């Protein structure tokens, strides 16, 4: 079996029946975790392992960026600072905020690996201008080159345990006003302006860049749908005139932004033809079983290859090992003494 296009979640700690025929359907290609899908370590270990068991094929991930977004923060997991900090740090020390940066990256990745988890969908590529209060923290700095460095440090860390990474929210959410949780978002820069700065990140990244997921932002001057479902920003820009060939995600449709493109059927079925390799239906496994059954029909050869690149690489130490690693720990004492 190979992966579908559908990212989704599960009921509970525990897998169900309904969860079994929904991860066995043609479609399903993923499942992302959130906070109501932990209880401890060796709960979580066993739903993953569950999960893999169903759909040997699939892949697991989760938000973990820190500071505020970051569903495990108990029984071991390391509670992670705003990426923000790291900014701050780099305004007194660039080569101290770059090692720091990549430690980060290092206790993520290896503390998921240990639970069974391919990817964490990081870094935040926004940049930190102040308009955004959903973003607020998360973002790195102001400066596309500061977010870039610093990004790509990160990712260094994450690809020393053999995780992947996913940059966020493209073309850039750090300039609209509104949160595309509940509403939908406008940015009415030129289409120069916004390549000049907020993509900057992911062209000078390269190879260190695995994925992206577009943001739910109308972006006027360039295109009157949703980066997600907008052509333009994901196949005339992205793939075009970046040459990325990393897998695409889309946000959770489910948000009220990603409504301007429909039903949910009809809002995957735009997000997969603009140019999305995945997308996310979050919060509502039922409807996205309605999504699985009724996704049109499309050539998915070219997407299959890039999410199959996103599950991680090689094995992952088991917590009983990981504890007494000494990169583990200096990553630690490191993360403690530098914030
Ligand atoms: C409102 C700003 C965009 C935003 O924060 N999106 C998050 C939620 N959607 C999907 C995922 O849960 C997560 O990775 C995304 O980053």
Same mark, same amino acid.
């Given at each position: 079996?190979?992966?579908?296009?559908?990212?989704?979640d599960?009921?509970?700690? &525990?897998?169900?029946?309904?969860?079994?025929?929904?991860?066995?359907?043609?479609?399903?290609?993923?499942?992302?975790?959130?906070?109501?899908?932990?209880?401890?370590?060796?709960?979580?270990?066993?739903?993953?392992?569950?999960?893999?068991?169903?759909?040997?094929?699939?892949?697991?991930?989760?938000?973990?960026? $820190?500071?505020?977004?970051?569903?495990?923060?108990?029984? $071991? =997991? &390391?509670?992670?600072?705003? *990426?923000?900090?790291?900014?701050?740090?780099?305004?007194?020390?660039?080569?101290?905020?770059?090692?720091?940066?990549?430690?980060?990256?290092?206790?993520?990745?290896?503390?998921?690996?240990?639970?069974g988890?391919?990817? #964490?969908?990081?870094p935040?590529?926004?940049?930190?201008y $102040?308009? #955004?209060?959903?973003?607020?923290?998360?973002?790195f700095?102001?400066?596309?080159?500061?977010?870039?460095?610093?990004?790509?440090?990160?990712?260094?860390?994450?690809?020393?345990?053999?995780?992947?990474?996913?940059?966020?929210? =493209?073309?850039?959410?750090?300039?609209?006003?509104?949160?595309?949780?509940?509403?939908?978002?406008?940015?009415?820069?030129?289409?120069?302006?916004?390549?000049?700065?907020?993509?900057?990140?992911?062209?000078?990244? $390269?190879?260190?860049?695995?994925?992206?997921?577009?943001?739910?932002?109308?972006?006027?001057?360039?295109?009157?749908?949703?980066?997600? =479902?907008?052509?333009?920003?994901?196949?005339?820009?992205?793939?075009?005139?970046?040459?990325?060939?990393?897998?695409?995600?889309?946000?959770?449709?489910?948000?009220?932004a990603?409504?301007?493109?429909?039903?949910?059927?009809?809002?995957?079925?735009?997000a997969?033809?603009?140019?999305?390799?995945?997308?996310?239906?979050?919060?509502?496994?039922?409807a996205?079983?309605?999504?699985?059954?009724?996704?049109?029909?499309?050539?998915?050869?070219?997407?299959?290859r890039?999410?199959?690149? *996103?599950?991680?690489?090689?094995?992952?130490?088991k917590?009983?090992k990981?504890?007494?690693?000494?990169?583990?720990?200096?990553a630690?004492?490191?993360?403690?003494s530098?914030?």
């Open positions: 079996t190979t992966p579908g296009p559908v990212m989704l599960v009921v509970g700690t &525990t897998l169900s029946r309904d969860d079994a025929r929904r991860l066995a359907h043609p479609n399903t290609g993923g499942v992302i975790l959130f906070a109501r899908h932990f209880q401890n370590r060796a709960q979580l270990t066993a739903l993953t392992d569950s999960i893999r068991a169903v759909r040997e094929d699939i892949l697991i991930a989760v938000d973990h960026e $820190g500071g505020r977004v970051q569903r495990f923060r108990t029984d $071991g =997991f &390391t509670v992670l600072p705003a *990426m923000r900090r790291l900014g701050e740090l780099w305004d007194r020390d660039v080569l101290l905020a770059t090692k720091v940066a990549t430690a980060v990256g290092y206790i993520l990745a290896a503390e998921l690996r240990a639970c988890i391919d990817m #964490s969908f990081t935040v590529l926004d940049l930190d $102040g308009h #955004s209060k959903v973003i607020g923290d998360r973002a700095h102001r400066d596309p080159r500061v977010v870039t460095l610093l990004a790509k440090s990160l990712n260094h860390g994450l690809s020393l345990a053999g995780m992947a990474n996913c940059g966020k929210h =493209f073309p850039g959410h750090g300039f609209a006003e509104a949160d595309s949780h509940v509403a939908l978002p406008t940015d009415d820069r030129t289409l120069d302006a916004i390549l000049e700065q907020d993509v900057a990140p992911y062209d000078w990244l $390269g190879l260190s860049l695995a994925a992206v997921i577009p943001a739910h932002v109308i972006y006027t001057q360039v295109d009157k749908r949703p980066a997600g =479902f907008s052509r333009v920003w994901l196949q005339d820009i992205l793939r075009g005139k970046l040459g990325f060939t990393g897998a695409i995600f889309s946000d959770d449709l489910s948000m009220e990603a409504r301007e493109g429909g039903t949910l059927t009809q809002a995957a079925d735009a997969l033809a603009a140019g999305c390799d995945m997308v996310l239906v979050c919060n509502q496994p039922d996205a079983e309605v999504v699985l059954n009724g996704l049109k029909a499309r050539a998915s050869a070219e997407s299959v890039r999410i199959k690149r *996103m599950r991680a690489r090689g094995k992952a130490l917590w009983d990981l504890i007494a690693q000494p990169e583990y720990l200096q630690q004492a490191l993360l403690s530098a914030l």
